[PDB]
mmCIF file of C-alpha atoms in Angstrom:
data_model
loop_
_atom_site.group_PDB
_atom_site.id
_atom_site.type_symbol
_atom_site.label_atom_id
_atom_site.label_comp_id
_atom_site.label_asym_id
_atom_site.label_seq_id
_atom_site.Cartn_x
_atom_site.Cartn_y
_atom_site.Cartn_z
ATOM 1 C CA UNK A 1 -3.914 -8.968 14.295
ATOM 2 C CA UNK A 2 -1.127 -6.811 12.881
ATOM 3 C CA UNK A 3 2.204 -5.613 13.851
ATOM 4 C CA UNK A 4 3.315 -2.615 12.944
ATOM 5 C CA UNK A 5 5.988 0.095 11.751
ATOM 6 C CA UNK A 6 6.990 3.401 13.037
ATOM 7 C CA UNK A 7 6.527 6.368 10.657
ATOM 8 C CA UNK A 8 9.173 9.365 11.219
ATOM 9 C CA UNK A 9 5.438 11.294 12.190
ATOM 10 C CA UNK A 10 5.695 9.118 14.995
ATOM 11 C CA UNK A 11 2.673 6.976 13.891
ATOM 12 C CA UNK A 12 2.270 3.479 13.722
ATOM 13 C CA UNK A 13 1.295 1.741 10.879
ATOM 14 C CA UNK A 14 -0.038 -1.765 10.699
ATOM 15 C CA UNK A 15 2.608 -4.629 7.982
ATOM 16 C CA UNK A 16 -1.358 -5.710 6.523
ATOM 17 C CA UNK A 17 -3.843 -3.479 5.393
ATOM 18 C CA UNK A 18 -7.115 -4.484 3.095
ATOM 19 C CA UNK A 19 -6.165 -2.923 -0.442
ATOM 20 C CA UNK A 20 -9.604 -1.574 -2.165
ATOM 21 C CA UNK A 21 -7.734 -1.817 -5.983
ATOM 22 C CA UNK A 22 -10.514 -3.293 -7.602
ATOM 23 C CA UNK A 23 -13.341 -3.688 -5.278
ATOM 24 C CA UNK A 24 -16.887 -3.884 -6.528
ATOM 25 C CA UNK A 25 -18.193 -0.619 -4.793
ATOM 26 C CA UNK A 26 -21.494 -3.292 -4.055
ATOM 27 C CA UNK A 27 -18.835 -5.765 -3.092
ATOM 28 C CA UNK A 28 -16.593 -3.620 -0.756
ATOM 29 C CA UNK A 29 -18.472 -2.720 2.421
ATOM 30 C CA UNK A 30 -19.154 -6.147 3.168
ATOM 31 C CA UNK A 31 -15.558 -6.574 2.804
ATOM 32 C CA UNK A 32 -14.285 -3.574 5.170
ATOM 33 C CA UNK A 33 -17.065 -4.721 7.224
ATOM 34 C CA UNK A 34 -15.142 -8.745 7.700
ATOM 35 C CA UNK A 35 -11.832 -7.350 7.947
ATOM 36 C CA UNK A 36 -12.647 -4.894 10.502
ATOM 37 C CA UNK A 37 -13.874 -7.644 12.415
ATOM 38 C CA UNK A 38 -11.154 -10.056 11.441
ATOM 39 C CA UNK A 39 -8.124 -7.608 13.018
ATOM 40 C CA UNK A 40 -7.511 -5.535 10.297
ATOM 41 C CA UNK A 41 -7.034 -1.283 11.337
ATOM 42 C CA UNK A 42 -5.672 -0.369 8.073
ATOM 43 C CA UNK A 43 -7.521 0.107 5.036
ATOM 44 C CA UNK A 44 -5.820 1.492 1.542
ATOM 45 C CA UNK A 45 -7.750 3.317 -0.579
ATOM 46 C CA UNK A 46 -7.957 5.580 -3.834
ATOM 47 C CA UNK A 47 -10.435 7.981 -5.438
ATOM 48 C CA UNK A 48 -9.633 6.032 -8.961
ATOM 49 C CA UNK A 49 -11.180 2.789 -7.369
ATOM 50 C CA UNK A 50 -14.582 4.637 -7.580
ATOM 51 C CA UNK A 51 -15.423 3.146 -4.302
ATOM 52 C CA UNK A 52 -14.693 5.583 -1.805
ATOM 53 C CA UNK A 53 -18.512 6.197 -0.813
ATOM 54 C CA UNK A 54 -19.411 2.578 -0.286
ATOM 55 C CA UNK A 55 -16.515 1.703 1.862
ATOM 56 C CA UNK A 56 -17.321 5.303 3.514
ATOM 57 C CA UNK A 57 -20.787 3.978 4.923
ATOM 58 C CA UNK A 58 -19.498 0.737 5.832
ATOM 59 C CA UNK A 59 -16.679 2.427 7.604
ATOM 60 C CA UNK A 60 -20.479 4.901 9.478
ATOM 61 C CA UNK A 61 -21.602 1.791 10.868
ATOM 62 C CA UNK A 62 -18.224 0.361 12.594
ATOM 63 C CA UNK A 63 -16.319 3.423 13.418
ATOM 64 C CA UNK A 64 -16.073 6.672 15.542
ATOM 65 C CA UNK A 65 -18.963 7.404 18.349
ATOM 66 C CA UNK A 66 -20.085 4.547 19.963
ATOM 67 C CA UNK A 67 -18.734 1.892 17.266
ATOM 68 C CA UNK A 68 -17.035 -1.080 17.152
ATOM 69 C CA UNK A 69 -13.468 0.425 16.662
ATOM 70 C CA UNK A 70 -12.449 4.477 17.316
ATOM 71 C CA UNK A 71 -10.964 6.552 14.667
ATOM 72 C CA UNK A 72 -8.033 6.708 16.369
ATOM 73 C CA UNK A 73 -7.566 2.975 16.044
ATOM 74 C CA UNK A 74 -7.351 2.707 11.788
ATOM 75 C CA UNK A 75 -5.078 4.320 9.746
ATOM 76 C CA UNK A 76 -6.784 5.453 6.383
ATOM 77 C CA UNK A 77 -4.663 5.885 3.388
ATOM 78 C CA UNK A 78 -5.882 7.371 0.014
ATOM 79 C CA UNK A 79 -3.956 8.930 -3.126
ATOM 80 C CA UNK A 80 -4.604 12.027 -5.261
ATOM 81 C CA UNK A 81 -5.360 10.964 -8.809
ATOM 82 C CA UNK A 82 -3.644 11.992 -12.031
ATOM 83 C CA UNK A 83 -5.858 14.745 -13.542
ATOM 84 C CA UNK A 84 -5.730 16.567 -9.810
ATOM 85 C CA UNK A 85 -2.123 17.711 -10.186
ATOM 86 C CA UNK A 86 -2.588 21.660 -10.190
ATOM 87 C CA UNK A 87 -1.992 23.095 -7.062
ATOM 88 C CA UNK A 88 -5.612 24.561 -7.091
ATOM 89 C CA UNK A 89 -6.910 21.247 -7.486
ATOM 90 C CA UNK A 90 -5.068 19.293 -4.790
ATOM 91 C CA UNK A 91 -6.952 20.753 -1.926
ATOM 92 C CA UNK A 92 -11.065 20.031 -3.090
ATOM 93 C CA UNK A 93 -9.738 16.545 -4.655
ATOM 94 C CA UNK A 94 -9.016 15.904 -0.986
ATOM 95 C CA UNK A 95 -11.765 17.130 0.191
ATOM 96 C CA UNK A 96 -14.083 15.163 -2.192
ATOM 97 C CA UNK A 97 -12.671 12.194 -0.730
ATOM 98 C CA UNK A 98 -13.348 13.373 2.985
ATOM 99 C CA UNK A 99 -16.453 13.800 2.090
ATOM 100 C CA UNK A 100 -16.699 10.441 -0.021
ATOM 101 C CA UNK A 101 -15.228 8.276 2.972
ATOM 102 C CA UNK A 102 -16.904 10.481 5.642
ATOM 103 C CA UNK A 103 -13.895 11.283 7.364
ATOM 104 C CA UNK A 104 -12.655 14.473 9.225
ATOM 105 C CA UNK A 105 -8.519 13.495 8.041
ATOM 106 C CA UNK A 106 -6.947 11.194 6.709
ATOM 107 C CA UNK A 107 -3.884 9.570 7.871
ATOM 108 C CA UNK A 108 -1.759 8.673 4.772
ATOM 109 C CA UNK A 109 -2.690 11.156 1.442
ATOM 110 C CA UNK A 110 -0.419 9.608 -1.995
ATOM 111 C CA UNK A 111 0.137 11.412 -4.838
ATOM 112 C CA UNK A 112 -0.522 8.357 -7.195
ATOM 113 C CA UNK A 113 1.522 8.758 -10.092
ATOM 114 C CA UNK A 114 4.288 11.681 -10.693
ATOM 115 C CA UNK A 115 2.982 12.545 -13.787
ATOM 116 C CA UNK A 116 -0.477 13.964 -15.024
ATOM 117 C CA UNK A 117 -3.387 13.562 -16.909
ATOM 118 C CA UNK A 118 -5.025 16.984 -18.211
ATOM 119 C CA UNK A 119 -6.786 19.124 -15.908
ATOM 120 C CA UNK A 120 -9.917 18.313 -15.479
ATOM 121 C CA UNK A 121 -12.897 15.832 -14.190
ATOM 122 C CA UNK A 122 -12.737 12.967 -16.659
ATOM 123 C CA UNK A 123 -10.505 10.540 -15.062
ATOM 124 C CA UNK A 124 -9.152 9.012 -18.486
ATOM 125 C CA UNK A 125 -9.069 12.024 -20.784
ATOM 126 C CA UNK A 126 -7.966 10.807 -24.161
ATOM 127 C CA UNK A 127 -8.217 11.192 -28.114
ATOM 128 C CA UNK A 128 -9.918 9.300 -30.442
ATOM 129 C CA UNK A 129 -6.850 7.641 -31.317
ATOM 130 C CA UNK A 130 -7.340 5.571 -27.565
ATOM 131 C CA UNK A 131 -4.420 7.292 -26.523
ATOM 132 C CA UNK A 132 -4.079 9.709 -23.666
ATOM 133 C CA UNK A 133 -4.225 13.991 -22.941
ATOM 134 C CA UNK A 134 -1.499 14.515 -20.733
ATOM 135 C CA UNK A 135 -0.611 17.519 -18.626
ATOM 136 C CA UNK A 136 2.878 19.134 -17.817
ATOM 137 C CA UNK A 137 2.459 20.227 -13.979
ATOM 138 C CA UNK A 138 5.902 19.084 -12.111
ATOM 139 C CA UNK A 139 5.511 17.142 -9.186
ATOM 140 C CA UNK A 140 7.203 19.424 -6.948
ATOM 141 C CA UNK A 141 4.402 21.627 -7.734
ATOM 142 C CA UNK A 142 1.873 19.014 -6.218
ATOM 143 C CA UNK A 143 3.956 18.563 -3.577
ATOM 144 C CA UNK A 144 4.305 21.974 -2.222
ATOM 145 C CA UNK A 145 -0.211 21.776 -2.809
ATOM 146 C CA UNK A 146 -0.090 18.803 -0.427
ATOM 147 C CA UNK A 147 1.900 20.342 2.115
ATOM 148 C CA UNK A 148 -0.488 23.141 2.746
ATOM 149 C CA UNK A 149 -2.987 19.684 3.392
ATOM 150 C CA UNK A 150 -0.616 18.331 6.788
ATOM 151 C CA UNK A 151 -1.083 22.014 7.568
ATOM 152 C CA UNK A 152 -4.465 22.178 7.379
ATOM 153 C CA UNK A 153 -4.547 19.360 9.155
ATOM 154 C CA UNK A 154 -6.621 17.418 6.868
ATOM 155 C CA UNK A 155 -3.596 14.462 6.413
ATOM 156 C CA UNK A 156 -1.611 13.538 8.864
ATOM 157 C CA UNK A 157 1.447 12.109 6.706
ATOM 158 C CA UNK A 158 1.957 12.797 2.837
ATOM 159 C CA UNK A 159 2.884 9.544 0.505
ATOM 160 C CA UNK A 160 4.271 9.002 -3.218
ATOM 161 C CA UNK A 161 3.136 6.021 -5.144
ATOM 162 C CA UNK A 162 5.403 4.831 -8.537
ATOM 163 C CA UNK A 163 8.303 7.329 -8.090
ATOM 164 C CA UNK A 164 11.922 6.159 -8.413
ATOM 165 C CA UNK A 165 14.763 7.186 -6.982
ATOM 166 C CA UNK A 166 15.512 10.116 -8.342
ATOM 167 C CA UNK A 167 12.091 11.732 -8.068
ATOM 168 C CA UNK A 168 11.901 10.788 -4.698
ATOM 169 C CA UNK A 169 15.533 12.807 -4.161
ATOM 170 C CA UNK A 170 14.020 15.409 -6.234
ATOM 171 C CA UNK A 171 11.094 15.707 -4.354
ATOM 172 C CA UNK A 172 12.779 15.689 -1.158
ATOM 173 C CA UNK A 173 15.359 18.608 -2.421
ATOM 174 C CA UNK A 174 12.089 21.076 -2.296
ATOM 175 C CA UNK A 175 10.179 19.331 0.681
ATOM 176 C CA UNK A 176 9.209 21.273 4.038
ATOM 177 C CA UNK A 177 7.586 17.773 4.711
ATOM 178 C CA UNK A 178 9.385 15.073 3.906
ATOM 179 C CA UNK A 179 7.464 12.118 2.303
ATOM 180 C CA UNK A 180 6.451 9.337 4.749
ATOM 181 C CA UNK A 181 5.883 6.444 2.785
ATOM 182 C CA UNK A 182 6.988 5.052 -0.680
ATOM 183 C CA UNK A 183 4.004 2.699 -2.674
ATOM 184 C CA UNK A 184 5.192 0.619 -5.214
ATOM 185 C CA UNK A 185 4.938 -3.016 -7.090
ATOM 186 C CA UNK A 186 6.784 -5.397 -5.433
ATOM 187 C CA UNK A 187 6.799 -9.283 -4.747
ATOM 188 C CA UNK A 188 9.436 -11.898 -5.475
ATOM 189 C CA UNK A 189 9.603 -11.375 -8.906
ATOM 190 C CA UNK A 190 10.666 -7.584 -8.531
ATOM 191 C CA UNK A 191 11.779 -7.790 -4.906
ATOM 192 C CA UNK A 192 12.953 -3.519 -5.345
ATOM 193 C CA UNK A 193 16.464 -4.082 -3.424
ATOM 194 C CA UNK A 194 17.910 -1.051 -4.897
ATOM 195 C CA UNK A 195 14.431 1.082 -4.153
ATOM 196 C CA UNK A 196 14.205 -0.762 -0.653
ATOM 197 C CA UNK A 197 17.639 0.611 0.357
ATOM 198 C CA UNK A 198 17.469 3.956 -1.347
ATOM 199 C CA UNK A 199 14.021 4.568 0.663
ATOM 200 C CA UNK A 200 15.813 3.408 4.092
ATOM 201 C CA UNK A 201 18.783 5.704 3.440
ATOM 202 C CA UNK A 202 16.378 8.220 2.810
ATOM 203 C CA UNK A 203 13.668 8.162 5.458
ATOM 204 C CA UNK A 204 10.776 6.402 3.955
ATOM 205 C CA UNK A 205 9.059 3.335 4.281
ATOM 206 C CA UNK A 206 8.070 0.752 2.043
ATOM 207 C CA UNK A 207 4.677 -0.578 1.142
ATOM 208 C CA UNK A 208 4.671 -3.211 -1.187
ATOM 209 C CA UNK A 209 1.253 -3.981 -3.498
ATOM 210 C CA UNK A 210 0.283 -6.544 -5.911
ATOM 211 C CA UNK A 211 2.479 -8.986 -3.786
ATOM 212 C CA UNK A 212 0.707 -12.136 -4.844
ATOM 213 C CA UNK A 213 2.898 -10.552 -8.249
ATOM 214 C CA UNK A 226 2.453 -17.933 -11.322
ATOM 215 C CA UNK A 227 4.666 -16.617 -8.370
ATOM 216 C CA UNK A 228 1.451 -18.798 -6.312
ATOM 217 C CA UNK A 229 2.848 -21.868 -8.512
ATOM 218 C CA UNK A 230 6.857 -21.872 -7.640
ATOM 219 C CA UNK A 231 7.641 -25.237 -5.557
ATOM 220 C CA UNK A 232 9.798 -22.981 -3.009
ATOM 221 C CA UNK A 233 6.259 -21.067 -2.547
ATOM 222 C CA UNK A 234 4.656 -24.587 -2.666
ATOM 223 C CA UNK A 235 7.258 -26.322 -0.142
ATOM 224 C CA UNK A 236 7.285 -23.363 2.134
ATOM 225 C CA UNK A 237 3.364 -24.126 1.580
ATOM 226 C CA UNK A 238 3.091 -27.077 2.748
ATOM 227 C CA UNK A 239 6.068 -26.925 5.472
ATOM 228 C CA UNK A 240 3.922 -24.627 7.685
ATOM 229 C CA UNK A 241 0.433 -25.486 6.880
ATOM 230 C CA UNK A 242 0.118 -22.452 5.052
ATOM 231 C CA UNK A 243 -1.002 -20.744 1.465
ATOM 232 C CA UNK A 244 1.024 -19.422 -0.728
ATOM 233 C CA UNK A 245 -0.004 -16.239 -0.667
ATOM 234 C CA UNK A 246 0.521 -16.512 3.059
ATOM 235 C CA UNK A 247 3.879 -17.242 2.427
ATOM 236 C CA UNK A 248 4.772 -14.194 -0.104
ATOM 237 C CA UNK A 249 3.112 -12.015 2.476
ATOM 238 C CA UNK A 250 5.285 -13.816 5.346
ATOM 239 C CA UNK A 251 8.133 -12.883 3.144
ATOM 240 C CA UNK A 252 7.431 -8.963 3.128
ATOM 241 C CA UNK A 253 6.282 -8.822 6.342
ATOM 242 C CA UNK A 254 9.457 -10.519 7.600
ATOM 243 C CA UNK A 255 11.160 -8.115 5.393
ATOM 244 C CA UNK A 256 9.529 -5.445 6.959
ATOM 245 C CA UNK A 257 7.863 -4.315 4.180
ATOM 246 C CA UNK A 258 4.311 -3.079 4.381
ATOM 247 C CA UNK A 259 1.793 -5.460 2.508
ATOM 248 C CA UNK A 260 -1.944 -4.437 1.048
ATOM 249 C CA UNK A 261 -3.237 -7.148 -0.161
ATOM 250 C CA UNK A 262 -6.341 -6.444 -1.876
ATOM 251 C CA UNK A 263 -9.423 -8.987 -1.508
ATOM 252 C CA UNK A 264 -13.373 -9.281 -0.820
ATOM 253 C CA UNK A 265 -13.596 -13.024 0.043
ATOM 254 C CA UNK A 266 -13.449 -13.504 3.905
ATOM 255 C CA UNK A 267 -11.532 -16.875 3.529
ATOM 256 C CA UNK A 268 -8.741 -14.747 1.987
ATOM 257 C CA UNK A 269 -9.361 -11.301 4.038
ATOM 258 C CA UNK A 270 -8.992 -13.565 7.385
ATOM 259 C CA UNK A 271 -5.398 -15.630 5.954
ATOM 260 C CA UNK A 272 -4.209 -12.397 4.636
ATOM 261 C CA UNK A 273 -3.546 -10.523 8.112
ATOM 262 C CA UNK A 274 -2.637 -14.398 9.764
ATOM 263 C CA UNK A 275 0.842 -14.242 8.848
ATOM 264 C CA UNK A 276 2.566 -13.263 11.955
ATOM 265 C CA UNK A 277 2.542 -16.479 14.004
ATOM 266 C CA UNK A 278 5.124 -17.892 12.443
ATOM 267 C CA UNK A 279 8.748 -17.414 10.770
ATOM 268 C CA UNK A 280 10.839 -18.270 8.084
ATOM 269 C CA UNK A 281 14.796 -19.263 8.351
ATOM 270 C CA UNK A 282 17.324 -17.334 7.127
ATOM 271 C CA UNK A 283 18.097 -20.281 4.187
ATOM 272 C CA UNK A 284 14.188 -19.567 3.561
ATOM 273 C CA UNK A 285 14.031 -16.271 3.445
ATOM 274 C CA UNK A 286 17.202 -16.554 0.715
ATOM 275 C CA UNK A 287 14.803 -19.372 -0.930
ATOM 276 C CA UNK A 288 12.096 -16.537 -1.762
ATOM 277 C CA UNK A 289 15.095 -13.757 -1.917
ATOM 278 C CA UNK A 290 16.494 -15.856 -5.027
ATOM 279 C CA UNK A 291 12.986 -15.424 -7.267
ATOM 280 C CA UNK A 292 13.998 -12.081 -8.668
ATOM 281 C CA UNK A 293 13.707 -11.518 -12.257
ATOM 282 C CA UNK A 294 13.227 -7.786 -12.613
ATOM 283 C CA UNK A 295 9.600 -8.337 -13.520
ATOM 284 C CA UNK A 296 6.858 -6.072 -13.114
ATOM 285 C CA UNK A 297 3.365 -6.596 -13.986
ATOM 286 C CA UNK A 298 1.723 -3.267 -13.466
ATOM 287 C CA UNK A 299 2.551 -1.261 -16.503
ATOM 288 C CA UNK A 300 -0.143 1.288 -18.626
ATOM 289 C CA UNK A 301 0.080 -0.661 -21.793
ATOM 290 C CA UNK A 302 -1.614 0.086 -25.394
ATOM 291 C CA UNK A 303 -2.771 -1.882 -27.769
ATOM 292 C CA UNK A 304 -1.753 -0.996 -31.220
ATOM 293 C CA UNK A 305 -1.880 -3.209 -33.816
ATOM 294 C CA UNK A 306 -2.406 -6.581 -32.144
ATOM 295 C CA UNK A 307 0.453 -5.661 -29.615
ATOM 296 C CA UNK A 308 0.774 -4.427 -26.067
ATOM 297 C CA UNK A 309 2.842 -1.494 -26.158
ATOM 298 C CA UNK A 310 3.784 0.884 -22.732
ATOM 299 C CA UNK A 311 1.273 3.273 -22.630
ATOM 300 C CA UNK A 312 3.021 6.342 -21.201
ATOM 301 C CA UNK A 313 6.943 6.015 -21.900
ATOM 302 C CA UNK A 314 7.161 9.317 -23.407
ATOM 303 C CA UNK A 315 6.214 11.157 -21.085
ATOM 304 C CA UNK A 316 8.813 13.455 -19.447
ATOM 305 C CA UNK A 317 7.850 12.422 -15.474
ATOM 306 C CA UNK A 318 7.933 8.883 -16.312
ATOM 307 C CA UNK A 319 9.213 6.289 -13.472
ATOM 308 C CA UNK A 320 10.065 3.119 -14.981
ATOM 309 C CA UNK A 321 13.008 3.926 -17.205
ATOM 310 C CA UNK A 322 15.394 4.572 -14.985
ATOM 311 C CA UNK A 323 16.900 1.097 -13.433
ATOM 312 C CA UNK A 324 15.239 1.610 -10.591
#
């Protein structure tokens, strides 16, 4: 169903991919299951979801051997989670998520956030006080763990998820391989035009999540709706797509899964396309928050490797 883009590995990587964020692990295979049927070669992933296992069996019965669709076929992405960032943990996190998804490599690896959580097994190490034990390890130390992955040959490209611009320059200024893709927020509401270009400049591509960002409820989302017998979030994932921006839409209703990847067969104007492109507010959603005293307050700002500070 797909198009894709071309990775500076060489490999291609489908605009729509099934995002696993908050899949029911009892929900999920039947979901991977539909979508693999539907069109879909690209599934997105993360050890965090707590799902890996389930959507590894589903993935036994349809692919490899004498299945459905060949290995060589899907493109697998998954992320290395916050309390993994020591360099002698990168490698058996990996390898737990193989193992988890029943795969022999994976083809995109993230490093979820840039900063950590302390070393250890508890995902969400914290204090009584609610709030959280972080951990000091730099980045570019993860980074130079991963590399010894692509090496291995257990990943075939290496990822960053939430970094701005200035990490990614950072981590590039160390790199022996330099990162393939760039994760973030983004939908109409925080369109990342200053991120977008920085990451072309630099090399990497962009894929967008959480691009449903009500954004469903604008009457430019609702005329554009309407105008080509469409949803709206057909249309906001028309919009990335057009802008060649990589879209993982996350879902496990096959009414949604199958409208999700349909949004190549058709093509906004250039007046359109500045219709959507005029929705920015500098808003993003996805933010660690804390609630202290009756009121939401950012959960990790302190924290010396933190992304969203910076403009952008």
């Amino acid at each position: 169903a797909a198009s894709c883009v071309l990775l500076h590995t060489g490999q291609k990587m489908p605009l729509i991919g099934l995002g696993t964020w908050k899949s029911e692990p009892g929900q999920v295979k039947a979901a991977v299951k539909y979508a693999l049927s539907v069109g879909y070669r690209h599934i997105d992933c993360a050890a965090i979801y707590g799902n890996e296992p389930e959507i590894g069996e589903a993935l036994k019965e349809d692919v490899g051997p004498g299945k459905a669709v060949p290995r060589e076929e899907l493109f697998v992405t998954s992320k290395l989670w916050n309390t993994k960032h020591h360099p002698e943990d990168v490698e058996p996190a990996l390898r737990k998520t193989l193992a988890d998804l029943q795969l022999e490599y994976l083809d995109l690896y993230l490093m979820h956030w840039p900063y950590a959580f302390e070393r250890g097994d508890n995902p969400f190490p914290k204090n009584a006080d609610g709030t959280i034990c972080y951990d000091s390890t730099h980045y570019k130390e993860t980074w130079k763990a991963l590399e010894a992955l692509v090496a291995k040959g257990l990943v075939q490209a290496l990822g960053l998820s939430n970094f701005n611009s200035r990490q990614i320059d950072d981590i590039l200024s160390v790199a022996s391989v330099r990162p393939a893709v760039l994760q973030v927020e983004c939908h109409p509401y925080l369109a990342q035009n200053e991120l977008i270009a920085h990451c072309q400049a630099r090399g990497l591509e962009v894929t967008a999540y959480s691009p449903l960002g009500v954004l469903l409820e604008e009457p430019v989302v609702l005329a554009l709706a309407e105008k080509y017998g469409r949803s709206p979030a057909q249309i906001l994932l028309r919009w990335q797509v057009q802008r060649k921006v990589i879209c993982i839409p996350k879902s496990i209703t096959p009414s949604r899964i199958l409208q999700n990847i349909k949004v190549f067969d058709f093509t906004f104007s250039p007046e359109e396309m500045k219709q959507l492109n005029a929705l920015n507010k500098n808003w993003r959603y996805i933010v660690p928050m804390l609630t202290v005293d009756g009121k939401r307050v950012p959960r990790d700002a302190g924290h010396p490797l933190y992304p969203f500070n910076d403009p952008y």
